[PDB]
Amino acid sequence: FFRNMYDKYRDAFLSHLNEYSLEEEIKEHISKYYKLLFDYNCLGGKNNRGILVILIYEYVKNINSSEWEKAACLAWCIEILQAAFLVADDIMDKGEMRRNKYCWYLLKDVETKNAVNDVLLLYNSIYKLIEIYLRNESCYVDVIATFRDATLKTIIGQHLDTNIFSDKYSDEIDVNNINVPEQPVIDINMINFGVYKNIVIHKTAYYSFFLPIVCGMLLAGIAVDNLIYKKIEDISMLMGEYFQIHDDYLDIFSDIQNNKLTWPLIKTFELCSEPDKIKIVKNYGKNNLACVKVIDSLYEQYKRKHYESYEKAQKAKILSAINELHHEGIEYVLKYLLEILFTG
Amino acid sequence: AFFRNMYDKYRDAFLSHLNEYSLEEEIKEHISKYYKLLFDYNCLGGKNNRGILVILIYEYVKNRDINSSEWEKAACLAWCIEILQAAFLVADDIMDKGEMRRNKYCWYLLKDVETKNAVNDVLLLYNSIYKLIEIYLRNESCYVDVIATFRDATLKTIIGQHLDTNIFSDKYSDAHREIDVNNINPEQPVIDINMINFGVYKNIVIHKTAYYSFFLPIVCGMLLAGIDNLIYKKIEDISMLMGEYFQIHDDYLDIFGDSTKTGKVSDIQNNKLTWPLIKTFELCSEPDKIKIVKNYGKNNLACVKVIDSLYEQYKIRKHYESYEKAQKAKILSAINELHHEGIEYVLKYLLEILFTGV
Ligand SMILES: CC(C)=CCC/C(C)=C/CC/C(C)=C/CC/C(C)=C/COP(=O)(O)OP(=O)(O)O
Ligand SMILES: CC(C)=CCC/C(C)=C/CC/C(C)=C/CCC(C)=CCOP(=O)(O)OP(=O)(O)O
Numbered sequence: 046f047f048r049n050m051y052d053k054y055r056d057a058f059l060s061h062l063n064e065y066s067l068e069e070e071i072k073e074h075i076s077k078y079y080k081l082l083f084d085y086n087c088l089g090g091k092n093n094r095g096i097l098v099i100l101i102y103e104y105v106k107n108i109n110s111s112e113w114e115k116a117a118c119l120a121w122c123i124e125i126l127q128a129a130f131l132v133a134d135d136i137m138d139k140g141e142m143r144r145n146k147y148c149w150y151l152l153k154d155v156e157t158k159n160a161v162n163d164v165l166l167l168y169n170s171i172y173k174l175i176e177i178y179l180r181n182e183s184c185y186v187d188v189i190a191t192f193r194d195a196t197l198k199t200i201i202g203q204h205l206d207t208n209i210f211s212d213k214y215s216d217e218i219d220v221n222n223i224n225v226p227e228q229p230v231i232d233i234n235m236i237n238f239g240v241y242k243n244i245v246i247h248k249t250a251y252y253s254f255f256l257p258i259v260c261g262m263l264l265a266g267i268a269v270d271n272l273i274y275k276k277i278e279d280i281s282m283l284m285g286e287y288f289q290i291h292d293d294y295l296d297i298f299s300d301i302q303n304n305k306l307t308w309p310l311i312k313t314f315e316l317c318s319e320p321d322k323i324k325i326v327k328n329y330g331k332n333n334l335a336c337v338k339v340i341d342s343l344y345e346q347y348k349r350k351h352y353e354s355y356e357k358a359q360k361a362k363i364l365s366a367i368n369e370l371h372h373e374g375i376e377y378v379l380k381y382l383l384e385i386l387f388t389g
Numbered sequence: 390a391f392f393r394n395m396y397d398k399y400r401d402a403f404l405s406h407l408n409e410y411s412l413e414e415e416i417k418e419h420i421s422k423y424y425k426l427l428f429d430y431n432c433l434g435g436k437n438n439r440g441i442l443v444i445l446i447y448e449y450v451k452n453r454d455i456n457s458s459e460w461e462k463a464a465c466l467a468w469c470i471e472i473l474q475a476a477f478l479v480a481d482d483i484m485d486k487g488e489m490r491r492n493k494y495c496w497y498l499l500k501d502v503e504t505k506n507a508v509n510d511v512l513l514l515y516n517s518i519y520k521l522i523e524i525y526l527r528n529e530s531c532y533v534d535v536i537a538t539f540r541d542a543t544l545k546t547i548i549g550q551h552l553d554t555n556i557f558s559d560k561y562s563d564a565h566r567e568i569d570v571n572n573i574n575p576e577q578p579v580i581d582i583n584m585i586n587f588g589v590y591k592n593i594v595i596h597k598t599a600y601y602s603f604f605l606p607i608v609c610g611m612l613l614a615g616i617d618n619l620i621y622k623k624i625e626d627i628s629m630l631m632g633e634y635f636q637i638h639d640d641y642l643d644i645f646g647d648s649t650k651t652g653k654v655s656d657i658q659n660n661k662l663t664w665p666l667i668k669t670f671e672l673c674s675e676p677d678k679i680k681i682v683k684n685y686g687k688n689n690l691a692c693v694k695v696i697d698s699l700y701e702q703y704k705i706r707k708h709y710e711s712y713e714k715a716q717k718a719k720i721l722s723a724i725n726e727l728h729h730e731g732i733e734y735v736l737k738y739l740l741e742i743l744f745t746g747v
């Protein structure tokens with residue numbers, strides 16, 4: 046039913062913009078543009094984060110029409126957040142396709158300049174929507190703080206993912222250099238699971254798991270002083286890692302060319318001979334067909350099988366963390382979520 | 390000067406927050422190094438008209454005693470509006486492909502930064518505002534109203550930007566064809582003559598400038614002081630007038646001002662709907678209209694000269710001078726109809742000091 050309510054939240058926000066002191070013709074142009082911005086970018090994903098909110102809310106509470114209206118609001122707000130992350134991420138990473146269609150920023154009628162502005166519109170629409178539907182709820186402030194704090198962590202994780210190999214992170218920033226572009230290179234001191242977990246937990250775990258779970262519980266009426274919140278934070282960290290490692294696995298089976306610190310990169314570096322370390326450093330992070338293939342060949346050489354081995358062990362560690370919650374409703378949801386992560 | 394001395398307190402309060410994240414120590418020192426510069430490079434160097442408006446309004450709203458922790462909350466909101474400006478300027482320079490801002494390279498041009506970091510940094514700077522308001526105004530009754538004011542003014546600015554970016558675009562000229570989500574090719578941008586009018590210009594400029602630059606600071610000062618009241622609507626209207634006044638001057642500077650004085654080099658080549666363009670178009674001959682259509686929006690210097698010579702031919706400088714006097718009087722007349730002495734003093738002082746600062 047979550048998908049049925051999309052139009053309401055979209056139209057609610059667009060109705061706010063329509064109240065502006067603007068000429069009727071100009072209002073028409075913007076409702077056209079912004080309806081598409083939402084539709085193109087909020088619709089078409091697996092909706093795991095949105096569904097997670099709704100499932101957690103239902104399995105803590107055990108629900109009328111207004112209650113679901115607030116739950117579905119927060120669910121779509123996180124999908125709107127994902128949309129904003131998606132648009133921004135594709136600008137930054139100069140992406141080609143997202144969800145089997147052209148990245149928003151690539152479109153002739155959009156371009157990078159609009160996509161930047163649109164990320165901030167999508168991002169700010171979130172808080173207008175929460176205001177519209179949850180202004181008079183007692184959890185109102187805690188909910189917006191949860192979005193804010195999870196977003197800040199995501200920004201920092203995104204920063205680390207972008208810059209972990211950059212010449213600035215190897216051992217001051219030059220405010221006079223606008224002319225000499227730094228060549229993308231690997232930094233071997235950063236190729237380790239400790240650094241990787243830092244990035245992954247901040248970039249993924251907080252907005253993807255912590256935020257949706259907390260929204261559900263917050264709206265349900267679980268007081269923020271409750272000890273479960275810290276347990277859920279710890280579980281969310283484990284799941285975020287699990288999800289991103291799998292995301293890294295799917296990419297190879299544009300991270301190689303984009304010089305990304307991936308789990309496949311770290312595992313390979315851990316497993317490979319010294320000559321192959323030189324081979325990785327020479328061939329990684331380059332937009333060259335021959336270079337990517339060499340990196341592709343090494344992943345095949347050092348066996349795909351190591352991911353499967355990790356996936357089984359991490360899943361077990363999560364189910365153990367889930368079981369110490371001592372909350373049946375959330376436990377089932379988290380066990381169900383864990384099963385349906387990759388499919389949606 | 391008091392406002393300026395408080396800068397580090399608020400910067401370091403946010404930097405400490407990031408420093409609390411569960412990260413390895415080496416990572417944490419890289420983060421703090423990057424983000425200290427992000428703030429320093431982009432928050433310092435302006436006229437600080439928006440920050441000072443907060444400070445002045447907070448004080449002159451009512452003649453009263455104000456303790457140092459009370460001033461700490463005001464200087465926070467004052468600096469939050471300067472962070473917002475810093476986020477706006479970084480974003481604007483990305484979108485417009487800027488060269489200089491406040492007499493130095495645009496943040497995004499730095500080879501250590503690039504567009505990819507700058508986009509991420511806009512969102513960090515923007516989000517730091519709300520973390521700061523939380524840290525310092527968490528337990529204030531006006532807290533929800535303050536962040537909602539930031540939120541709503543930002544939304545309007547985003548809409549103003551959208552229009553400034555897209556007013557002459559294909560989508561606006563061809564309102565009948567839907568956006569082709571399969572077209573990843575744009576053809577040379579041109580002006581749309583139906584859009585060259587002052588009614589459209591005010592729509593754009595009020596939203597892009599007036600709400601964040603005037604309404605937001607004044608409302609911040611008032612809400613925190615403890616004032617809902619009918620004066621807010623009257624203050625919304627003056628803000629409209631001052632924003633329009635401010636942006637027209639800003640259009641004047643673009644073509645007629647020294648880049649070593651203003652700190653920045655664009656409107657003609659960026660195909661912008663400007664006051665000098667609208668003023669030229671209602672005043673010039675038909676052959677000159679075609680000349681404008683032919684030459685406006687082009688990066689070639691021979692094309693911008695043609696436009697620049699037309700501004701000289703039609704003496705746009707004197708037309709602005711005439712506007713400036715007319716509008717300044719129009720604003721003072723609305724300010725005098727507020728029936729509030731303290732805010733009147735501030736708005737009068739601000740109107741005198743807009744273009745120089747302090
Ligand atoms: C929501 C965010 C952060 C944004 C994305 C994109 C948006 C809406 C944009 C920013 C566009 C904007 C309003 C502009 C820039 C205006 C600017 C930097 C200029 C001039 O103001 P002055 O007051 O003259 O400059 P100082 O602050 O240096 O005195
Ligand atoms: C604060 C904002 C909006 C922006 C600035 C830039 C930031 C922090 C970025 C975004 C980085 C990010 C979290 C990434 C992209 C991850 C992504 C879009 C996801 C994949 O998630 P799935 O759930 O597999 O995709 P679906 O939603 O299509 O199912």
Ligand code: NA
Pocket residue numbers: 090091092093094095124127
């Ligand atoms: Na999702």
